[PDB]
Design a protein around this ligand. Sequence first.
Ligand SMILES: CC[C@@H]1C(=O)N(C)c2cnc(Nc3ccc(C(=O)N[C@H]4CC[C@@H](N5CCN(CC6CC6)CC5)CC4)cc3OC)nc2N1C(C)C
Length: 120
Amino acid sequence: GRVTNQLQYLHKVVMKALWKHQFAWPFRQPVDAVKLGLPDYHKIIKQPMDMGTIKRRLENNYYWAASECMQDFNTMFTNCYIYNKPTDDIVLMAQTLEKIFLQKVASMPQEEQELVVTIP
Ligand SMILES: CC[C@@H]1C(=O)N(C)c2cnc(Nc3ccc(C(=O)N[C@H]4CC[C@@H](N5CCN(CC6CC6)CC5)CC4)cc3OC)nc2N1C(C)C
């Protein structure tokens, strides 16, 4: 991947705010459906995603475009809404975190530019 202004913003602003939030703990690591006794989790959820995985990807310059990282955040929230019951508190926690995600994304740099200054 590469380092861009937008991906650096996603790492140092958006992820920093979401990771520390009081509602982040269910999303800081992949769902362990074996330990949770949930044999249907991976039958229903085709693309598991979590903030621990996203954070490691950002640390390792896995992404090529901010939009890919935004899709990973979105998949994580969508998985929660699809799998759980509409009245479960975790749905409310995801809605709270996703609202912060969108609020912070609103102030991301407009044009994606690689943060490299190279010598030919
Ligand atoms: C999946 C459906 C839905 C959903 O959509 N998502 C995203 C979701 C995600 N996560 C959870 N639960 C947990 C999440 C995280 C933890 C944790 O801190 N786990 C660590 C704590 C102990 C650690 N151990 C390991 C070895 N230990 C050494 C030996 C002495 C013990 C020392 C400590 C290992 C794991 C616990 C959870 O269970 C309480 N539920 C979810 N739901 C619920 C509605 C079921």
